[PDB]
Design a protein around this ligand. Structure first.
Ligand SMILES: [Cl-]
Ligand SMILES: [Cl-]
Ligand SMILES: [Cl-]
Ligand SMILES: [Cl-]
Ligand SMILES: [Cl-]
Ligand code: NA
Length: 129
C-alpha cells in the first residue's frame, strides 16, 4: 500500500508516534517519505547482504528475520515480511524500539541527511489530526 501523507500521519499518531522520545510527528512522516516514498512494500538490499524493509526501511541486520542475513539479530522478534503489510502496526512498534536504543532518529540515514534540522512540521501541515 502507498499511503497518502496525511493518511500516514493519522495512522502514526493513532499508534503513538507523535512526540515519541521527543520526536514530533513531522519527523516520522519526513523519514517515511525519503526512506520508502510512503510505500509499505519497499525493499532495498545493503552492501553487506542485509535488506531494508517497509515504510521505515527497517534493516534485517538487527531488527527482523528474513532467513538470508547470516549472523544477524531479530530484535523486534518479527519476520521481515511483516514489515511489508498494509497495516503499519509492526513497523511502528519496531520503530519505537529502534529510536529508543540511544541514537534516536539518527538510525535512519535519510532522516539525518534530509529531515534533521529542517522545518518538519511542514510534513503534517493541512492534515486533520
Ligand atoms: Cl511536527
Ligand atoms: Cl527524492
Ligand atoms: Cl537470517
Ligand atoms: Cl534523541
Ligand atoms: Cl531533501
Ligand atoms: Na535478522
Amino acid at each position: 500500500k502507498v499511503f497518502g501523507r496525511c493518511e500516514l500521519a493519522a495512522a502514526m499518531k493513532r499508534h503513538g508516534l507523535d512526540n515519541y522520545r521527543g520526536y514530533s510527528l513531522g519527523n516520522w512522516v519526513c523519514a517515511a517519505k525519503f526512506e520508502s516514498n510512503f510505500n509499505t512494500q519497499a525493499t532495498n538490499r545493503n552492501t553487506d547482504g542485509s535488506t531494508d524493509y517497509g515504510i521505515l526501511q527497517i534493516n534485517s541486520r538487527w531488527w527482523c528475520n528474513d532467513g538470508r542475513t547470516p549472523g544477524s539479530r531479530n530484535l523486534c522478534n518479527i519476520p521481515c515480511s511483516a514489515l511489508l503489510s498494509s497495516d503499519i502496526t509492526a513497523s511502528v512498534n519496531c520503530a519505537k524500539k529502534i529510536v529508543s536504543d540511544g541514537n534516536g532518529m539518527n538510525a535512519w540515514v535519510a532522516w539525518r541527511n534530509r529531515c534533521k534540522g529542517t522545518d518538519v512540521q511542514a510534513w503534517i501541515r493541512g492534515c486533520r489530526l
